[PDB]
Structure 1
Amino acid sequence: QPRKKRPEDFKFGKILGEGSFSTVVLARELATSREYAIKILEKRHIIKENKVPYVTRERDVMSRLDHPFFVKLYFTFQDDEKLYFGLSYAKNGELLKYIRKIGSFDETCTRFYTAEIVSALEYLHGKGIIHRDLKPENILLNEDMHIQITDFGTAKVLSSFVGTAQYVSPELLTEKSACKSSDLWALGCIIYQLVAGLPPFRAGNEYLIFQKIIKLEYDFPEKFFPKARDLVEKLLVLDATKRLGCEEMEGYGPLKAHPFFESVTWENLHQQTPPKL
């Protein structure tokens, strides 16, 4: 392994993302002219807020990941006040930006991108890892328009916390307990949102959003692709042991075999040419 990289190795540029405890900044390494997305975390603030476990878990998780549909951790370093993580640079930014830009996806685009998300989840779940906060903001688009999922501090590695309100599963609001199915719940929401242009549970505030979730209070627009609707209904199920794709439903085989995915070749998605948006 090379000697530890340092801030002076980079020409920093624009801000790519902002969070409570971190900022992501585009940086060009000078020796290589390579673009990384460098996640910068201020030690003092992290310690002051008891986030050390989350930072730790993100670093450890993103190291165990080796797959085209996941943002990669290339390196780390620190100076006196800050931690730096060198991450894949997803040139095209958030899936959310495209949902907003074009409104809603047609069937072909919805099918391809849902399949990539599914295939990524299958990989993540095979390593015993749960994202716990999957959402279109976390789902980045590479320069070639394939997905790269990021943001893993809130992940759990299988042998407390609440993600974004509209993607939260009922079992979180009723038990403080999660599992792979929580990721599948969020997948159901993301599919709905690709198709309809909006997340299925919307309300004036978080409390109300939570109410609708535990009540399964949402419904399909009339233009919704039927096969996608059937898939979403097999995902947005209050009982987590009955969500298509989870272990009690015998996993990813039956999920991938869903009629909505009829025309999909699962084996080499990352090699396929994403449909034009």
Structure 2
Amino acid sequence: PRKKRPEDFKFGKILGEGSFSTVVLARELATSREYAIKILEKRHIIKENKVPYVTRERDVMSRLDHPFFVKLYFTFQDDEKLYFGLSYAKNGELLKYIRKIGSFDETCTRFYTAEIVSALEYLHGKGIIHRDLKPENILLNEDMHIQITDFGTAKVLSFVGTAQYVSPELLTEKSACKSSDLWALGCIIYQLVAGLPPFRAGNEYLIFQKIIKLEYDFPEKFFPKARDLVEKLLVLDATKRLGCEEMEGYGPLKAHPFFESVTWENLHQQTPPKLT
């Protein structure tokens, strides 16, 4: 199949903006298909020494083949810019829904947590670490299943993700591991239930302080089984987090009582609970 060009598309609104890319909604003229096209400027990438990150994004996404991940359909470039044609996840960032309805009830929390767990099991099965898992990086497609994105900063078995989801080892030994993503999962579950992430403060230095001290509390309402799970994930020692290899992997994690009524095998086939 011939390489696509910018002229093959009618570009529309901006879906996302970051430091090194802009995601634009585009309609392909030949098919009327909609893609989220991520556009990177070559000069800026080179000037900021990000070529390894752009290269890794492309390489990681081509290896992923699972419904809970944004897919890479095509790439091309012109003189100034790289273009990656990605899945258009019509309902946007999970963060928007958390802000919109405040907290998730237990059924919605359990369902979307289970999807994120299944996605991490697949990702870690590929020897890949995300390193920046967070609600902004978890999209919702038209059917309200998740699609995780943003892989330029992944590590395939230097970088620190968004402060409130950074794991202790990142701040202490400067190392990242699969377990680092499980710390982020713990933060996300907490945020889904509480409406806010567990470690928050007026600036990044203070957030970091609280993290290494494990300084946070549960709200009185917090679903008790969800609380038990979070306490097994937000563990300073990375080798003792439920789900990590030293704890015998995803079996014990998926067996946790919070997920008692989850059918793990066909989640993306299931109708998600309505979000209120």
Place the TM-score, normalised by the shorter chain, in its bin. over 0.9
Distance (Å, rounded) in 1 between the aligned partners of 2:88 and 2:128? 23
Distance (Å, rounded) in 2 between the aligned partners of 1:13 and 1:175? 44
1:205 aligns with 2:203: yes
Shift of 1:121: 0.2
Distance (Å, rounded) in 1 between the aligned partners of 2:13 and 2:174? 37
Checking the alignment, whether the CA contact within 8 Å between 1:94 and 1:139 is kept in structure 2 is yes
| Structural mapping, 1:1-277, within 5 Å | 2-158=1-157, 160-277=158-275
Distance (Å, rounded) in 2 between the aligned partners of 1:264 and 1:257? 9
Distance (Å, rounded) in 1 between the aligned partners of 2:173 and 2:84? 33
Shift of 1:105: 0.1
Shift of 1:128: 0.3
Shift of 1:99: 0.2
1:94-144 CA distance string (max 9 Å, x none): 000000000000000000000000000000000000000000000000000
Distance (Å, rounded) in 1 between the aligned partners of 2:173 and 2:7? 47
Shift of 1:259: 0.1
1:38-73 CA distance string (max 9 Å, x none): 000000000000000000000000000000000000
Distance (Å, rounded) in 1 between the aligned partners of 2:107 and 2:52? 40
Three-state SS of the structure 1 residue aligned to 2:75 is strand
Checking the alignment, whether the CA contact within 8 Å between 1:134 and 1:187 is kept in structure 2 is yes
1:153-205 CA distance string (max 9 Å, x none): 000100x1111000000000001101100000000000000000000000010
Shift of 1:263: 0.3
Three-state SS of the structure 2 residue aligned to 1:192 is helix
Q: What TM-score do the two structures reach when normalised by structure 2? A: 0.99
Checking the alignment, whether the CA contact within 8 Å between 1:16 and 1:24 is kept in structure 2 is yes
Q: What TM-score do the two structures reach when normalised by structure 1? A: 0.99
Q: CA RMSD in A?
A: 0.3
Checking the alignment, whether the CA contact within 8 Å between 1:76 and 1:86 is kept in structure 2 is yes
Three-state SS of the structure 1 residue aligned to 2:12 is strand
Distance (Å, rounded) in 2 between the aligned partners of 1:200 and 1:153? 26
Q: Displaced runs of 4+ in structure 1, greater than 4 A? A: none
Distance (Å, rounded) in 2 between the aligned partners of 1:132 and 1:58? 13
Checking the alignment, whether the CA contact within 8 Å between 1:105 and 1:195 is kept in structure 2 is yes
Distance (Å, rounded) in 2 between the aligned partners of 1:176 and 1:41? 28
Three-state SS of the structure 1 residue aligned to 2:160 is coil
Checking the alignment, whether the CA contact within 8 Å between 1:93 and 1:142 is kept in structure 2 is yes
Matched-pair identity in %? 100
Three-state SS of the structure 2 residue aligned to 1:148 is strand
Three-state SS of the structure 2 residue aligned to 1:76 is strand
Checking the alignment, whether the CA contact within 8 Å between 1:161 and 1:176 is kept in structure 2 is no
Unaligned runs of 5+ in 2: none
